[PDB]
C-alpha cells in the first residue's frame, strides 16, 4: 500500500523583498520513503538544498523538510518539484508568499 | 509540563543496489537531538541539538555501538520477514520502529511504547500492560512467539520504565533553556480577494514551540467550520512551527469573523479580527 | 540514550 506526499512550500520568515530568508519544501504523509525533491528558481534547480533527517508520523508515513537560503525579490519565481512512485509525473508547487 | 523521549528507525532494502539503508533519529518532545545513517561516512551517532554535545566520548561511543547493532539486526530482519511472507527478492521493503517513554511534570513514568511496522502497516507492538504483544498477522505471530520465549517484554519494560525515564530527565535538565521553553505564536491575519463576491481570510501562527496549537474561526461569536481550511502544522526549519487556518467569506462581511489562537505559550488566548 | 538490544524477528 502506497501513499502520495502532501507538499507545502513556504519561507521560514515572513518574506521581505531583498532580505535574507529560507525557502522550505515540506513533504509529508508519503510511503515508501524514497522521494525526489528539488527547489526551483525561475524554473531551474537550486544546487545547494539540504534536508532534515528521515522521520515518520504516527500512521507510519514519512516526512522531510527540504530547505535552501534565499533572498526573495519581486520577480524571482520559486517552486518545489516532487517526484514519488505514486506520482505519474513530477508535481510542481509554486511558492506563494501568502501560504 | 509532560515530556517524551522517542527513537525512530527506518530500514529500507535496496535489491538493485547493495545493502539496506538504516536511518535512526531521537527526539525529546518536538526537538530532534541525535541521528544515525548507515550510509553516512562517519559511522557514528551524531549530535543534532546543542545541549547533547556536552555528552562525552563514552556516551557517543556507547550510542554508536548500540545503534550499529540495531542497524545490523534490521538488516537480518528484512531478510527474515521477506521469507515469512514468501516475498520476491526483487522488491524493496521497509521496517520502521518507534519506541520511547512519557513522563509528567514530576519526572514520573507515565507510559512506554514500542511499535513495529513492515511496509508501513502495523507488524507487532508492545501492549499497554508492558507485558504482552499484539501481532498484526501470521508472520508477526512467529515474531511474537520468539519474543515470548526470549522474554523480550521484560527486558524492554526495564528500559522503558528505567533507563528511558532517567536519560529523559537528564536531557530535560541539560537542555532546559530550550527544551522547557515555550515560544508563543506570532499571529497575524491576511486577506485575499477571490472575486467581487468572496474573499479568503487567513489566520497565521508563526514561530511557536511546542508544535501543539489550536486555531479556530468564528462568525458573530459562533464557532465556524463551514468553509474552513486548516493546513498541517509544519516546521519552520529553526526549531519552531507554523500553522494557518483560512475561511472563505462574503465580500463585505469580513468584519464579522474572528480567529482564535490557543497555545501553551500564551497566558490568554488571542483573538484576531480583520 | 537508545535501548541496548534490538531483537531478531
Give me the CATH number covering residue B195.
Answer: 2.60.40.10
Residue B247 and residue B164 in one domain: no
Residue B35 and residue B157 in one domain: yes
Measured between alpha carbons, how far is residue B24 from residues A59, B27, B179 in Å?
Answer: 17, 10, 21
Residue B244 and residue B118 in one domain: no
Q: Does B150 touch chain C (CB under 8 A)?
A: yes
Residue B101 and residue B172 in one domain: yes
**Experimentally, how was this structure solved?**
X-ray
Antiparallel, parallel or unpaired: β B214-219 and B222-224: antiparallel
Full domain range(s) for residue B229: 182-274
> Quick check: C1 and B62 CB within 8 A?
yes
Eight-state DSSP code of residue A5: P
Beta bridge partners of B219: B222, B257
Residue B162 and residue B218 in one domain: no
> Quick check: A54 and B25 CB within 8 A?
yes
Q: Tell me how far apart the alpha carbons of residues B154 and B126 are, in angstroms, rounded to a whole number.
A: 11
Q: Tell me how far apart the alpha carbons of residues B243 and B49 are, in angstroms, rounded to a whole number.
A: 23
**Smallest Cβ distance to B80: which of C2, C6, C8?**
C8
Angle between helices B57-85 and B138-149 (to 10 degrees): 130
Q: Tell me how far apart the alpha carbons of residues B15 and B242 are, in angstroms, rounded to a whole number.
A: 38
Total residue count of chain A as it appears in this document: 99
Which residues 78-107 on chain B approach chain C with CB closer than 8 angstroms? 80-81, 97, 99
Where is the domain boundary, B181, B201, B217?
Answer: B181
Q: What are phi and psi of B109, to 5 degrees?
A: -55, 125
Antiparallel, parallel or unpaired: β B133-135 and B121-126: antiparallel
Q: Does B183 touch chain A (CB under 8 A)?
A: no
**Smallest Cβ distance to B237: which of A6, A22, A99?**
A22
CA distance to partner chain B, nearest, from residue A45 (Å)? 20
Q: In a mutagenesis test of the C interface, which of B36, B163, B172 is the best target, namely the one with the most C β-carbons within 10 Å?
A: B163
Full domain range(s) for residue A55: 1-99
Q: Does B67 touch chain C (CB under 8 A)?
A: yes
User: Residue B34 in contact with residue B19, Cβ under 8 Å?
Assistant: no
Query: Cell triple for residue A29?
Result: 504523509
Where is the domain boundary, B181, B211, B240?
Answer: B181
CA distance to partner chain B, nearest, from residue C4 (Å)? 5
Reduced to 3 states (helix: H, G, I; strand: E, B; else coil), residue A6 is: strand
Task: Indicate which CATH number applies to the domain containing A93.
Answer: 2.60.40.10
Which residues 32-91 on chain A approach chain B with CB closer than 8 angstroms? 32-34, 52-56, 60-62, 65, 67
Reduced to 3 states (helix: H, G, I; strand: E, B; else coil), residue B267 is: coil
Query: Which chains sit next to A, with 3 or more Cβ pairs under 8 A?
Result: B
The CA angle B84-B86-B92, to the nearest 5 degrees, is 95
Query: Cell triple for residue B166?
Result: 532517567
Residue B49 and residue B117 in one domain: yes
Where is the domain boundary, B136, B163, B181?
Answer: B181
Query: Cell triple for residue B135?
Result: 501481532
Q: What are phi and psi of B121, to 5 degrees?
A: -130, 155
Q: Do chains A and C touch (3 or more CB pairs under 8 A)?
A: no
Residue closest to B168 by CA, chosen among B185, B150, B180: B180
Burial of B120 (0-12, 13-18, 19+ CB in 10 A): buried
Q: Tell me how far apart the alpha carbons of residues A22 and A12 are, in angstroms, rounded to a whole number.
A: 5
Residue B90 and residue B165 in one domain: yes
- Dihedral, CA of residue B162, residue B129, residue A59 and residue B145, to nearest 10: 100
Query: Cell triple for residue B15?
Result: 535489491
Contacts with A95 from chain B: Cβ below 8 Å: none
Q: Which residue of B has its CA nearest to A58?
A: B98
E strand or H helix at A83: strand A78-83
Q: Is the peptide bond before B172 cis (omega within 30 degrees of 0)?
A: no
Number of domains in chain A: 1
CB count in 10 Å sphere of residue B97: 20
Residue B29 and residue B134 in one domain: yes
Q: Does A20 touch chain B (CB under 8 A)?
A: no
Number of domains in chain B: 2
Residue B5 and residue B80 in one domain: yes
CA distance to partner chain C, nearest, from residue B244 (Å)? 35
Residue closest to B99 by CA, chosen among B26, B172, B173: B26
Eight-state DSSP code of residue B268: S
Residue B191 and residue B175 in one domain: no
Residue B229 and residue B95 in one domain: no
User: Residue A32 in contact with residue A85, Cβ under 8 Å?
Assistant: yes
> Quick check: C4 and B66 CB within 8 A?
yes
- Dihedral, CA of residue A80, residue A81, residue A82 and residue A87, to nearest 10: 130
Q: Does B267 touch chain A (CB under 8 A)?
A: no
The residues, ordered by sequence, that sit 6+ positions from A69 with a Cβ below 8 Å of its Cβ are A20, A21, A22, A23, A48
Query: Which chains sit next to B, with 3 or more Cβ pairs under 8 A?
Result: A, C
Contacts with B96 from chain A: Cβ below 8 Å: 56, 60
Task: Indicate which CATH number applies to the domain containing B17.
Answer: 3.30.500.10
The residues, ordered by sequence, that sit 6+ positions from B184 with a Cβ below 8 Å of its Cβ are B208, B263, B265, B266
Amino acid at each position: 500500500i502506497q501513499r502520495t506526499p502532501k507538499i507545502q512550500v513556504y519561507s521560514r520568515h515572513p518574506a521581505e523583498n531583498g532580505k535574507s530568508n529560507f525557502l522550505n519544501c515540506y513533504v509529508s504523509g508519503f510511503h515508501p520513503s524514497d522521494i525526489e525533491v528539488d527547489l526551483l528558481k525561475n524554473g531551474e534547480r537550486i544546487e545547494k538544498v539540504e534536508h532534515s533527517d528521515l522521520s515518520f508520523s504516527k500512521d507510519w508515513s514519512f516526512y522531510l523538510l527540504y530547505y535552501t537560503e534565499f533572498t526573495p525579490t519581486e520577480k524571482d519565481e520559486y517552486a518545489c518539484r516532487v517526484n514519488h512512485v505514486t506520482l505519474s509525473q513530477p508535481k510542481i508547487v509554486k511558492w506563494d508568499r501568502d501560504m | 509540563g509532560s515530556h517524551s523521549m522517542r527513537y525512530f528507525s527506518t530500514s529500507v532494502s535496496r535489491p538493485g543496489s547493495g545493502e539496506p539503508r538504516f536511518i535512526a533519529v531521537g527526539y525529546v518532545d518536538d526537538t530532534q537531538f541525535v541521528r544515525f545513517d548507515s550510509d553516512a561516512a562517519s559511522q557514528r551517532m551524531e549530535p543534532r541539538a546543542p545541549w547533547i554535545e556536552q555528552e562525552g566520548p563514552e556516551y557517543w561511543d556507547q550510542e554508536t555501538r548500540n545503534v550499529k547493532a540495531h542497524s545490523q539486526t534490521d538488516r537480518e530482519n528484512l531478510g527474515t520477514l521477506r521469507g515469512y511472507y514468501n516475498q520476491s527478492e526483487a522488491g524493496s521493503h521497509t521496517i520502521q520502529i518507534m519506541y520511547g517513554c512519557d513522563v509528567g511534570s514530576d519526572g514520573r513514568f507515565l507510559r512506554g511504547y514500542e511499535q513495529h511496522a513492515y511496509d508501513g502497516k502495523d507488524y507487532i507492538a508492545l501492549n499497554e500492560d508492558l507485558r504482552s504483544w499484539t501481532a498484526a498477522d501470521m508472520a508477526a505471530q512467529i515474531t511474537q512467539r520468539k519474543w515470548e520465549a526470549a522474554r523480550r517484554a521484560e527486558q524492554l519494560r526495564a528500559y522503558l520504565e528505567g533507563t528511558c525515564v532517567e536519560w529523559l530527565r537528564r536531557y530535560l535538565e541539560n537542555g532546559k533553556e530550550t527544551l522547557q521553553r515555550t515560544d508563543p505564536p506570532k499571529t497575524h491575519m491576511t486577506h485575499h480577494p477571490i472575486s467581487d463576491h468572496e474573499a479568503t481570510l487567513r489566520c497565521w501562527a508563526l514561530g511557536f514551540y511546542p508544535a501543539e496549537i489550536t486555531l479556530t474561526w468564528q462568525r458573530d461569536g459562533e464557532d465556524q467550520t463551514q468553509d474552513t481550511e486548516l493546513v498541517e502544522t509544519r516546521p519552520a526549519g529553526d526549531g519552531t512551527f507554523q500553522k494557518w487556518a483560512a475561511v472563505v467569506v462574503p465580500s463585505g462581511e469580513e468584519q464579522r469573523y474572528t480567529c482564535h489562537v490557543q497555545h501553551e505559550g500564551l497566558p490568554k488566548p488571542l483573538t484576531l479580527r480583520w | 540514550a537508545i535501548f541496548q538490544s534490538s531483537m531478531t524477528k
